[PDB]
Coordinates of C-alpha atoms in Angstrom, one line a residue:
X642 CA 60.7 166.6 -85.3
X643 CA 59.1 165.9 -88.9
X644 CA 56.6 163.6 -87.5
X645 CA 55.1 166.9 -85.5
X646 CA 55.3 169.0 -88.7
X647 CA 53.1 166.5 -90.8
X648 CA 50.8 166.1 -87.8
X649 CA 50.6 170.0 -87.7
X650 CA 50.3 169.9 -91.5
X651 CA 47.2 167.7 -90.9
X652 CA 46.0 170.0 -88.4
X653 CA 45.6 172.6 -90.8
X654 CA 44.4 170.9 -93.6
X655 CA 41.4 170.3 -91.1
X656 CA 40.8 173.7 -89.7
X657 CA 40.7 174.6 -93.8
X658 CA 37.9 171.7 -94.6
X659 CA 36.3 173.3 -91.1
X660 CA 36.2 176.9 -91.7
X661 CA 34.8 175.8 -95.3
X662 CA 31.9 173.7 -93.4
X663 CA 31.5 176.3 -90.7
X664 CA 30.9 178.5 -93.6
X665 CA 28.0 176.5 -95.3
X666 CA 26.5 175.8 -91.7
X667 CA 26.5 179.7 -90.8
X668 CA 24.7 180.2 -94.5
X669 CA 21.7 178.0 -93.2
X670 CA 21.0 180.7 -90.7
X671 CA 20.5 183.9 -92.4
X672 CA 18.7 185.8 -89.8
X673 CA 22.0 185.5 -87.6
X674 CA 19.7 183.3 -84.6
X675 CA 23.4 181.7 -83.4
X676 CA 26.0 184.2 -85.0
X677 CA 26.9 185.2 -81.5
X678 CA 26.7 184.6 -77.8
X679 CA 23.2 184.7 -76.0
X680 CA 23.3 188.1 -73.9
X681 CA 23.8 187.6 -70.4
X682 CA 23.1 191.2 -70.2
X683 CA 19.8 190.5 -71.9
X684 CA 19.1 186.8 -71.2
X685 CA 20.3 187.5 -67.2
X686 CA 19.3 184.4 -66.3
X687 CA 20.4 181.7 -68.8
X688 CA 23.3 180.1 -67.5
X689 CA 20.9 179.1 -65.1
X690 CA 19.0 176.8 -68.2
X691 CA 21.7 176.1 -70.6
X692 CA 24.9 174.9 -68.8
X693 CA 28.0 175.1 -72.2
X694 CA 26.3 178.1 -74.0
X695 CA 28.0 177.9 -77.9
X696 CA 27.6 180.1 -81.1
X697 CA 29.1 180.5 -84.5
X698 CA 31.5 183.0 -83.2
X699 CA 32.5 181.3 -80.6
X700 CA 33.1 177.9 -82.5
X701 CA 35.2 180.2 -85.6
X702 CA 37.7 181.4 -82.6
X703 CA 38.1 177.7 -81.3
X704 CA 39.0 177.4 -84.8
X705 CA 40.9 179.5 -85.8
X706 CA 43.7 179.2 -83.0
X707 CA 43.2 175.3 -84.3
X708 CA 41.3 173.7 -81.1
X709 CA 38.9 171.5 -83.3
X710 CA 41.4 168.3 -83.2
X711 CA 38.7 166.2 -85.4
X712 CA 35.5 166.3 -86.7
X713 CA 33.6 165.0 -83.9
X714 CA 34.4 168.0 -81.8
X715 CA 33.1 170.6 -84.7
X716 CA 30.1 168.8 -84.5
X717 CA 29.9 168.7 -80.9
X718 CA 29.6 172.0 -80.9
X719 CA 27.3 172.6 -83.2
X720 CA 25.2 170.8 -81.8
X721 CA 25.2 172.3 -78.7
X722 CA 23.8 175.4 -80.6
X723 CA 20.7 173.6 -81.7
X724 CA 20.2 171.5 -78.6
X725 CA 20.8 174.7 -76.0
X726 CA 18.0 176.6 -78.2
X727 CA 15.7 173.6 -79.0
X728 CA 15.3 173.9 -74.9
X729 CA 15.4 177.1 -73.7
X730 CA 12.6 178.3 -76.1
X731 CA 9.6 176.7 -76.6
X732 CA 8.5 175.1 -79.6
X733 CA 6.2 177.4 -80.9
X734 CA 9.1 180.6 -81.2
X735 CA 10.7 181.8 -84.5
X736 CA 14.1 180.3 -82.0
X737 CA 13.3 176.8 -82.0
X738 CA 11.7 176.8 -85.5
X739 CA 15.1 178.1 -86.4
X740 CA 17.2 175.7 -85.3
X741 CA 15.5 172.9 -86.6
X742 CA 16.1 174.3 -89.7
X743 CA 19.8 174.6 -88.7
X744 CA 19.6 170.9 -87.9
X745 CA 18.0 169.4 -91.1
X746 CA 20.2 171.5 -93.5
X747 CA 23.2 171.2 -92.1
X748 CA 23.1 167.7 -91.9
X749 CA 23.9 167.3 -95.4
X750 CA 27.0 168.9 -95.2
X751 CA 28.1 167.0 -92.3
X752 CA 27.0 163.9 -93.7
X753 CA 30.1 164.8 -96.6
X754 CA 32.1 166.3 -94.4
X755 CA 33.0 162.9 -92.5
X756 CA 33.3 161.4 -96.1
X757 CA 35.9 164.2 -96.8
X758 CA 38.0 163.5 -93.3
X759 CA 37.4 159.8 -93.9
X760 CA 38.9 159.7 -97.5
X761 CA 41.3 162.6 -97.3
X762 CA 42.8 161.4 -94.0

């Protein structure tokens, strides 16, 4: 139908906007700490600690499959990245500190994304 097409076009455009958001958030992780899944070869007990692992490569896969229906879903996954790290790693570590800086810097990007999503509909 024409309606399904128009709905598909909306999703495509949201995907374009989320791709730009994702690129901007990932630039705030220049050490690439959050770029890939935590390795289960190298941290074999990780899943005993963290039940829903997340990382930027995994978000990118979902994004490119148009698997984010709205900004809320995308934000949920970004928050997992931060929140998982801040639980597994102690406060005095380069990992925890990188998550705090990513959270703080990402807030600005996400604040305007929410306005753009609402604005363009």
